[PDB]
Write a protein that binds this ligand. Structure first.
Ligand SMILES: Cc1cc2nc3c(=O)[nH]c(=O)nc-3n(C[C@H](O)[C@H](O)[C@H](O)COP(=O)(O)OP(=O)(O)OC[C@H]3O[C@@H](n4cnc5c(N)ncnc54)[C@H](O)[C@@H]3O)c2cc1C
Ligand SMILES: Cc1cc2nc3c(=O)[nH]c(=O)nc-3n(C[C@H](O)[C@H](O)[C@H](O)COP(=O)(O)OP(=O)(O)OC[C@H]3O[C@@H](n4cnc5c(N)ncnc54)[C@H](O)[C@@H]3O)c2cc1C
Lengths: 325, 314
């Protein structure tokens, strides 16, 4: 290579291997660059929000393409700084060769990279509902985050909430339905064949201080989703032969962390599949390995991802400067 | 005038909070007295997508985004003098410097902090101009020094803080002198801690003489530190993270729990204060005083506000 310190195997050793060039990884690299620390940032080119044209709820970046944030971040990292190296390849394996001290990353081309520390910023993959038409409607009628979307489609007569998967409880369903009520006159909560749940959600709503006004409950099984002709509408085909048109649908899917690294490094995971990290610096259960962004928090958004990246760099700088080379 | 949220502050923290609320069509009045902690700076660093940009540009973009595409966020360029609760979590009243009152279901305090100067002649002249508080914020621009100083005074007067800063300053300078302003016991403790640490004390010097005054040098960001009676040392720049105090009387008026540093005590995931319905975000509510945490706090605060407004009666 051309940056870092030589090892006995013939390779150069950088301070940090950052696996990910979304906002989380780019923000981590941003902090390191301030203190002249070296990093190889890997990018497989798989971004969770690749299906979108417009970012929201990111201060100063309203309605901008998420690709623009990544481009600005990359430009900022190579223009006034020269310690940050970008590698467009997919990491297939990571191993700790020395405790907290040396890590090896191997890519899809057979090439090896060495860092004193590792940052996992691989993001997550959204798991589709096994229902016909779901894939056509995802991020195009079915929305997961009403801070991220929904405002553009406000003023509806009726929209739906899918109380399925992780939304199949009164807390999540009601929180999402009440958010949807800001955007629609009426909200129908779909339970896909769970009457008991529909009853639980209704009762919880009726028994809550604000009540159940504006809410509809649909317990019938869902046969398929059809992308309606107009705007972001989705026709939900229920039972044998009835259907209903909704302005759009709200569903926050189950996710899984991208890459095999939690398995390979035996990193503690959350019940939800996320890599378990602890504030203040978001170090994982193996020292010297950090995790930031979607792969390491239930707060899966751009501003928390960038914040995690900054704080991780603070911790990395501390470790790099306090620990013998 | 009753809105959902009275937001006191239009820095990154307040603006981020408003950005969140606007997505869900919640109403807010954002107050701005026009006093920003980084008012003295031309170049913001360590904020993804904004390297070397003017911090005023971030505030301008955040304001423009909110006024352009959203209609539920109001801005008031006035100073708030007093806030009080009218009914428990039900209602808050903010009184401005013109004797107008505003009512909100909730309140966000995003007032920032004021950096307390050292009581040493010449400090004021050298602040953010030779004396730097955050080596992620600055320092990189003045790299390649022969010598720089760390002021191990106030909150930096302990081996951990002094060594952490000194090792950061060593990235930017051949040598770092740690000043203890007359505390010889501290100088020795810092040296031993460095000497006994895994990385050692190489590149560090220790200066325990009392500091009489700071004189800003004519060249670049240099500061002449006047020691003893007549002796002096010229540094490339000095590094010191000051004690801070929250802006505004609101933590006192509402009797909000404070941290041991004087910040408003808040807790993730939503940064609500010790008084239900009052939130605090950004510098006034965290020891992590930087733009990206301030912005993230604003977003999460908006999530908690959104949750309460929609689960509680109007
Ligand atoms: C449809 C949709 C819309 C959204 N809209 C918004 C919005 O408006 N506002 C908002 O704040 N949030 C939004 N989000 C959430 C947002 O996308 C995430 O919070 C954010 O992208 C997380 O950033 P990250 O860096 O953690 O992961 P990502 O941005 O997904 O980046 C992951 C990086 O890791 C890399 N990677 C993964 N595995 C490997 C490997 N083995 N080797 C090398 N590289 C690897 C990828 O190539 C990629 O570069 C949206 C999400 C979705 C699905
Ligand atoms: C010299 C210097 C350089 C810095 N450089 C960087 C950097 O490069 N990168 C970085 O990330 N961070 C930097 N910081 C830290 C950064 O400035 C803060 O983290 C950030 O400004 C916090 O934002 P905030 O919204 O919490 O407070 P502020 O940005 O200070 O805004 C506070 C708001 O509250 C308002 N307000 C206060 N009291 C009242 C009242 N009574 N009525 C009405 N309104 C009121 C003010 O008018 C203002 O609008 C720097 C700080 C300093 C001092």
């Amino acid at each position: 290579m051309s940056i870092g310190k030589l090892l006995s195997n013939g390779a150069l050793l950088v301070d940090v291997l950052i696996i990910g060039a979304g906002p989380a990884g780019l923000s981590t690299a941003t902090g390191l660059a301030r203190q002249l620390h070296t990093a190889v940032v890997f990018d497989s080119g798989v971004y969770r929000n690749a299906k979108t044209q417009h970012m929201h709820n990111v201060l100063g970046w309203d309605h901008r393409n998420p690709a623009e944030l990544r481009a600005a971040g990359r430009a900022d990292l190579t223009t006034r700084y020269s310690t940050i190296q970008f590698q467009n390849s997919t990491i297939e394996a990571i191993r700790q060769v020395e405790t907290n001290q040396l890590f090896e990353a191997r890519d899809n081309e057979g090439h090896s990279w060495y860092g004193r520390k590792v940052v996992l910023a691989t993001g997550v993959r959204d798991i589709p509902l096994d229902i016909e038409g779901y894939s056509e409607c995802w991020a195009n009628g079915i929305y997961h985050c009403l801070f991220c979307d929904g405002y553009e489609e406000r003023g509806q007569e009726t929209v739906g909430v899918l109380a399925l998967g992780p939304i199949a409880n009164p807390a999540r369903a009601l929180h999402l339905a009440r958010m949807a009520l800001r955007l629609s006159e009426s909200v129908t909560i779909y339970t896909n064949g769970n009457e008991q749940l529909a009853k639980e959600i209704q009762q919880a709503a009726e028994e809550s201080p604000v009540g159940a006004s504006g809410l509809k409950f649909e317990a019938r099984p869902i046969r398929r989703f059809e992308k309606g002709d107009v705007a972001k509408t989705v026709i939900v085909h229920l039972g044998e032969s009835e259907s209903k048109t909704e302005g759009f649908l709200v569903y926050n899917p189950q996710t899984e962390v991208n890459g095999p690294f939690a398995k390979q490094l035996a990193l503690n995971m959350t019940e939800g599949g996320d890599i378990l990290t602890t504030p203040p610096f978001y170090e994982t259960s193996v020292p010297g390995v950090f995790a930031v962004g979607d792969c390491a928090t239930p707060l899966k958004a751009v501003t928390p991802a960038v914040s995690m990246g900054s704080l991780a760099a603070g911790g990395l700088v501390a470790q790099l400067q306090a620990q013998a080379l």
